[PDB]
A paper describes a structure:
TssA subunits are enigmatic as they possess a conserved N-terminal region of unknown function, previously identified as ImpA_N (PFAM: PF0681226), whereas sequences located C-terminal to this region are highly divergent. Consistent with this, phylogenetic analysis has suggested that the TssA family can be subdivided into three clades (TssA1, TssA2 and TssA3). The structural studies presented here show that TssA1B, TssA2A and TssA2B possess structurally diverse CTDs that lead to distinct overall architectures for their respective complexes.
Nested deletion of consecutive helical segments of TssA1B CTD revealed that loss of α15 resulted in the failure of the protein to assemble into a high molecular weight ring, and structure determination of the construct H12–H14 (helices α12–α14) and of that consisting of α12 and α13 alone (residues 303–347), revealed them both to be dimers. In the assembled Bc TssA1B CTD ring, analysis by PISA32 revealed an extensive dimer interface (~950 Å2) between monomers in the different layers, which principally involves the interaction of residues located in helices α12–α13 with their two-fold related subunits forming a region of hydrophobic packing with hydrophilic interactions at the periphery.
Numbering used by the authors:
A (entry chain A): 303 to 347
B (entry chain B): 302 to 347
């Protein structure tokens, strides 16, 4: 991974994969929530 | 692309390392790390 944009693309791909294969799992939830937050960089946490 | 579950976990781990290194205090670093940990747990019929 060379930069943030590539890292976000890879994270989104992984979230999609776990949603498809393990849809109601805690792993699918956490991966998806990580992708969500990657698109909200200005949200204070 | 991702060909199987092992590869998905491996990619998740690489993403978690990238964010740990570049944005250690962000929600993305924290969540990607937890997701990666949880991906190593035994499977269940969720």
């Amino acid at each position: 991974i060379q930069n943030r944009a590539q890292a976000v693309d890879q994270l989104r791909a992984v979230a999609r994969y776990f949603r498809q294969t393990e849809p109601h799992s805690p792993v699918a939830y956490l991966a998806d929530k990580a992708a969500e937050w990657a698109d909200m960089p200005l949200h204070k946490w």
